[PDB]
Copies of this chain bind each other. A is one copy, B any other.
Amino acid sequence: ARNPITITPQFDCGATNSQQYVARSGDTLTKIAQEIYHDVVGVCDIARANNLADPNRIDAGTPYTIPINCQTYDRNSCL
């Protein structure tokens, strides 16, 4: 019923918008994606958005780009 629109993604997951999230001690990608962001992004979307090799290595005090409006969600391909 709504008209289709064309968007230009900034991430492979199709997201156009993002936030900067600074990891806290004890944060993991699963906690960030699933709890802090209430599962609106996949753990592996975050990893690819940040060009991360190992998704289990997250550094306290480092900002991570969180794509917040993905069209698709990759929860485990990088796992």
Contacts and interface: CB of A to CB of B under 8 A. Distances in A.
Contacts of A7: 4-7, 14, 71
B4 A4 contact: no
Given A6-B7, A37-B38, 20 more contacts: A2-B8, A2-B12, A4-B7, A4-B9, A5-B6, A5-B7, A5-B8, A5-B71, A7-B7, A7-B71, A16-B71, A19-B39, A36-B38, A37-B40, A38-B38, A38-B40, A38-B68, A40-B40, A69-B69, A69-B70
A46 interface: no
| This chain's copy number in the assembly | 2
Interface residues of A, number: 24
Interface of A: 2-10, 12, 14-17, 19, 36-40, 68-71
